[PDB]
């Protein structure tokens, strides 16, 4: 009864949606994200999965701050000046 009959009893989840990485990996009893380790201050990343790294790095997301830093760099990070008016 280890296969088909035993799959019926699967009706209570171990993981839920982590609230750093969004992934369904936040173990409810351990209260740790299997993906990012949420309560741990630092990101759970390992050098033995180069593929797993490049799924969740600086390229992946928007870079909503970091994309305008690249744009703001190429004018020496200028501040409080406007272009000359009409």
């Amino acid at each position: 009864t280890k296969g088909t009959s035993s799959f019926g009893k699967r009706r209570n989840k171990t993981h839920t949606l982590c609230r750093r990485c969004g992934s369904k990996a936040y173990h409810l009893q351990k209260s740790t994200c299997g993906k990012c380790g949420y309560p741990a201050k630092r990101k759970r990343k390992y050098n033995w999965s180069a593929k797993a790294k490049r799924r969740n790095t600086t390229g992946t997301g928007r870079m909503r701050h970091l994309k305008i830093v690249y744009r703001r760099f190429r004018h020496g990070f200028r501040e409080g000046t406007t272009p000359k008016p009409k």
Binding site: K13, T16, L17, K24
Partner: protein, 50 residues
């Protein structure tokens, strides 16, 4: 279930609104490649995670 958390009901809300077919003027656009919505998701077939 009937008993939900607010967080899950917002997740289930987004997944409903993504599950509509493409408008019939989207394929009349100049550089159209989309024939139909490939990311559609029926509730028997693909079980949305969780």
């Amino acid at each position: 279930s009937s008993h939900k958390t607010f967080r899950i009901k917002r997740f289930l809300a987004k997944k409903q609104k993504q599950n509509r077919p493409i408008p019939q003027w989207i394929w009349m656009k100049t550089g159209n490649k989309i024939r139909y919505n490939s990311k559609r998701r029926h509730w028997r077939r693909t079980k949305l995670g969780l």
